From a paper:
The best, highly diffracting crystals of NmqNOR only grew in the presence of zinc sulfate, which was used in the crystallization condition. The crystals diffracted to ∼3 Å resolution, leading to a refined structure at 3.15 Å resolution in space group P212121, revealing only a monomer in the crystal lattice. Additionally, three Zn2+-binding sites were observed, of which the Zn1 and Zn2 binding locations were particularly important in order to understand the properties of the proton-transfer pathway. Zn1 is positioned near TMII, close to the predicted entry to the water channel, and is ligated by His257, Glu573, Glu576 and His577 [Fig. 2(b)]. The third binding site for Zn (Zn3) was observed near the periplasmic region where the zinc ion has three waters bound, in addition to His172, which itself is ligated to Glu709. The presence of zinc totally abolished the NO-reductase activity for both enzymes, while the presence of other divalent cations, such as magnesium and calcium, did not significantly reduce the activity. From the overall structure, TMII in the crystal structure moves significantly outwards compared with the cryo-EM structure. Alignment of the monomer and dimer structures of NmqNOR shows that Zn1 binding may cause the TMII loop region to splay away and into the symmetry-related molecule of the dimer, specifically clashing with TMX. The monomeric crystallographic structure of NmqNOR may result from disruption of the dimer interface owing to zinc binding near the dimer-stabilizing TMII region.
A quinol-dependent nitric oxide reductase (qNOR) plays a critical role in the survival of the bacterium in the human host by combatting the host’s immune response. qNORs belong to the broader family of nitric oxide reductases (NORs). NORs are largely found as the essential component of anaerobic nitrate respiration, also known as denitrification, in the bacterial cytoplasmic membrane and catalyse the reduction of nitric oxide (NO) to nitrous oxide (N2O). Whilst cNORs are pre­dominantly found in denitrifying organisms as a respiratory enzyme, qNORs are also found in several pathogenic bacteria, including the Gram-negative, human-pathogenic bacterium N. meningitidis, as an enzyme that is responsible for the detoxification of NO produced by the host. High-resolution structure determination of N. meningitidis qNOR (NmqNOR) is of importance to provide a framework for developing a knowledge-based strategy for the design of new antibacterial agents, as well as to help to understand the chemistry of NO reduction, 2NO + 2 H+ + 2e− → N2O + H2O, at the heme and nonheme iron (FeB) binuclear centre.
Author numbering: 2 to 250, 253 to 257, 273 to 306, 323 to 584, 591 to 748
The structure:
């Protein structure tokens, strides 16, 4: 049409940004910490082969993987980071040993001058004994092997049942015998070791580790890289030079069968939401019987979110589809809508059940990757059920894309608003696919890549787009926006959302085995996602303090903007710069970001859809002004309560000790089980309840709208 300029602008951004994201992926595959063929102990005693690790990886998924504690910065925050906790002990044990044989004292009786003399040896041994090329085999010294075999007892007693370390496990919210088979434990530790190896050893090319010196370990000088600083100030420039430009100031002056089906869709979303916040409190109480332990209550807490939020978005789109098609279903829509609904119930019910058996070792650890627990945060489904939800999303696009070719028919009307909105829904449908391309014993580095195409590009990138696209469609069809307004703004917002979104992804991969390039791309581009925030919060305040148009959605789609500013913005870009994330990755800083960002934005959006559909599916069914009120505030103040008086304080405290002593310490057992940390953990269950309250209210309100 006449918008060809903006269309080319969009095609430009998509071409540019997808290449960066593609390239930085090829380099993930190439220059990722390889699994060694064998770990030989100078003498000969091979400690492990290739599959000694790859098994311990498979064995890690068995426990719930990232659902117990973090590994390489990614996971859960009650247990320690295993890659950090491993490296630290394996170093300390190495020292005590060499301080003995050289001076005959336990390093603490050895004088400052000598301590620092030992650590020089330590760093050279550890950091400069890199994977021998052309025959990828690694060679260790004997004082190290003795070091490992003196810490393995503790790890067997924590992942097991050794009665000594009972409260240890309890402090880590771990059900006694998290891995009952000492068969597998032996292998899990070969994985735990190799991770710690990838994080403590220089690349073939550099004087930093495969993990860009992650984590922060003073005893081998795992200090921020050099390129770290170069780019983590670049980005802070860009951001500020961003805000300066955008803001240079004020107070500106501008029913058919299928549709009727969506009632149970609405119910599902509120149902599942309240299923989730419960499981949330449950898994929150574990941080202060274990058929369903911490590892499980958390897994569902993560899983229900994606579902109920995604489902709310699907549901919305399904309602609009007939409305697009004049006002009539083309064929057996209602039929496909029922199929889809079954599907979604088979994925949700299916997975949850599968999860139960894997984390009790009832499922055979040969079906573990497909029907058990993937061990990978946000994708702990099982390759089968994940494909089933994939098929489901495909069907949703099928049903979706049908109603649209009927409106691509008339000769008169401008088919541009449609055009972009059509791409939008594809975005939702097709783009869960990336996270398919990784196997059981796929390199951790690679899985880490694709996972974030989903947990980042999908739920942030394409949902962002769909929200605005559907909004524009409605906003124009309601008649509060002209054609050449709603049509135009969608095409720009699509360009803006995607500019920071696409390459930004890489803010996840700064340390999980990438080239220092990751810090460059991620840091720069993710700084541009500032203009969407400012723009929204700007307009959202402008279109607010006014009387012109009048349980009103502005509430919903203002709160949205607000959290998109506190959570995606403040807490998001506080943690975005490589220099920062180098310390506060895997700390309660991320917990803040997540809660405020996921619920605060996409939670409300999702809830404001299923609510809107219910207001249309059962009209003249009168809302409750007191419920909606109570809810809208307990939820808001609730999130405010969670982040303020618990998560952030701890995050802060963690952040500090991470920086002063090392990360291993901010994750260490004694540090966690502390005076005010344990207390700040308690104060949470105050605002936890408040939150569940508003959650109940919104399910309750929603129910009595769809049912009667
Ligand atoms: C009272 C309500 C809630 C409570 C008590 C709660 C509690 C928790 C707990 C215990 C964790 C795990 C922390 C750890 O690993 O140690 C967590 C993480 C998480 N929660 Fe919630 N949660 C609540 C509401 C929500 C909501 C509304 C959402 C959004 C749908 C959500 C999404 C998440 C996500 C995505 C994570 C993973 C965070 C990360 O790995 O950094 N939670 N929450
Ligand atoms: C807009 C909606 C957003 C949502 C729903 C969201 C969601 C999340 C979630 C759930 C995590 C934790 C993942 C995990 O446990 O492994 C996370 C991490 C992160 N997000 Fe966001 N995010 C959003 C926007 C942003 C923005 C705008 C930035 C840019 C500053 C950003 C930067 C980050 C960074 C740097 C992390 C790293 C945390 C870590 O790996 O420990 N996010 N995000
Ligand atoms: Ca996490
Ligand atoms: Fe991200
Ligand atoms: Zn205790
Ligand atoms: Zn965004
Ligand atoms: Zn305006």
């Amino acid at each position: 049409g006449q918008y060809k300029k903006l269309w080319y602008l969009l095609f430009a951004v998509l071409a540019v940004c997808f290449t960066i994201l593609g390239y930085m992926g090829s380099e993930v595959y190439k220059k990722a910490p390889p699994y060694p063929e064998q770990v030989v102990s100078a003498s000969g005693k091979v400690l492990m082969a290739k599959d000694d690790i790859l098994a311990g990886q498979s064995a890690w998924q068995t426990t719930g993987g990232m659902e117990v504690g973090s590994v390489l910065g990614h996971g859960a925050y009650q247990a320690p980071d295993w890659t950090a906790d491993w490296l630290h002990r394996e170093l300390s044990a190495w020292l005590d040993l060499t301080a003995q044989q050289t001076y005959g004292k336990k390093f603490d009786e050895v004088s400052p001058e000598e301590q620092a003399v030992l650590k020089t040896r330590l760093a050279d041994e550890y950091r400069n004994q890199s994977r021998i090329k052309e025959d990828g085999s690694v060679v260790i010294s004997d004082t190290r092997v003795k070091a490992i075999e003196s810490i393995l007892p503790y790890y067997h007693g924590v992942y097991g049942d050794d009665p000594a370390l009972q409260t240890t496990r309890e402090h880590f919210a771990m059900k006694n015998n998290t891995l009952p088979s000492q068969e597998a434990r032996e292998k899990l530790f070969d994985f735990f070791f190799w991770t710690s190896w990838s994080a403590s050893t220089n690349r073939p090319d550099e004087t930093f580790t495969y993990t860009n010196n992650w984590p922060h370990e003073p005893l081998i000088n795992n200090v921020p890289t050099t390129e770290n600083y170069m780019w983590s100030f670049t980005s802070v420039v860009l951001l500020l030079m961003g805000i300066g430009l955008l803001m240079w100031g004020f107070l500106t002056k501008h029913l058919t069968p299928s549709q009727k089906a969506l009632g149970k869709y609405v119910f599902l979303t509120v149902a599942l939401f309240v299923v989730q916040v419960l499981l949330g409190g449950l898994t929150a109480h574990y941080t202060v019987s274990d058929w369903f332990p911490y590892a499980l209550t958390r897994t569902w807490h993560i899983q229900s979110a994606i579902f109920w939020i995604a489902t709310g978005f699907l549901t919305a789109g399904l309602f609009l589809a007939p409305i697009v098609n004049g006002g009539k279903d083309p064929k057996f829509q209602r039929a496909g809508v029922n199929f889809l609904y079954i599907a979604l119930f088979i994925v949700v019910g299916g997975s949850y059940a599968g999860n139960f058996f894997a984390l009790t070792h009832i499922l055979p650890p040969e079906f573990n990757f497909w029907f058990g627990h993937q061990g990978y945060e946000y994708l702990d489904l099982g390759r089968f059920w994940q494909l089933l939800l994939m098929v489901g999303l495909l069907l949703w696009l099928f049903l979706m894309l049908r109603c649209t070719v009927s409106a691509f028919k008339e000769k008169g009307v401008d088919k541009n608003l449609l055009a972009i909105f059509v791409a939008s829904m594809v975005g939702v449908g097709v783009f869960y696919a990336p996270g398919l391309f990784y196997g059981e014993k796929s390199p951790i580095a690679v899985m880490e890549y694709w996972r974030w195409w989903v947990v980042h590009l999908w739920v942030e990138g394409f949902f962002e787009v769909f929200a605005t696209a559907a909004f524009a469609f409605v906003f124009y069809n309601m008649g509060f926006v002209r054609r050449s307004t709603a049509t135009a703004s969608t095409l720009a917002a699509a360009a803006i959302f995607m500019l920071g979104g696409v390459p930004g992804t890489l803010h996840h991969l700064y340390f999980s085995g990438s080239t220092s390039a990751s810090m460059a791309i991620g840091a720069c581009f993710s700084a541009l996602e500032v203009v969407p925030l400012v723009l929204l919060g700007r307009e959202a305040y402008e279109h607010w303090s006014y009387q012109h148009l009048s349980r009103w959605p502005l509430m919903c789609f203002v709160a949205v903007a607000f959290w998109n500013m506190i959570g995606a913005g403040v807490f998001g870009f506080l943690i975005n710069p490589p220099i920062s994330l180098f310390y506060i990755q895997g700390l309660n800083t991320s917990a803040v970001h997540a809660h405020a960002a996921l619920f605060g934005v996409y939670g409300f959006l999702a809830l404001g859809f299923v609510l809107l559909v219910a207001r249309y599916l059962k009209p003249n069914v009168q809302f409750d002004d007191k419920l909606m009120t109570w809810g809208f505030w307990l939820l808001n103040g609730g999130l405010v309560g969670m982040i303020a008086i618990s998560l952030l304080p701890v995050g802060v405290i963690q952040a500090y000790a991470s920086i002063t002593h090392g990360l291993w310490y901010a994750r260490s057992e004694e540090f966690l089980q502390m005076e005010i940390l344990d207390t700040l953990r308690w104060v949470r269950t105050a605002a936890d309840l408040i939150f569940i309250g508003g959650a109940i209210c919104v399910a309750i309100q929603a129910t009595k709208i769809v049912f009667g």
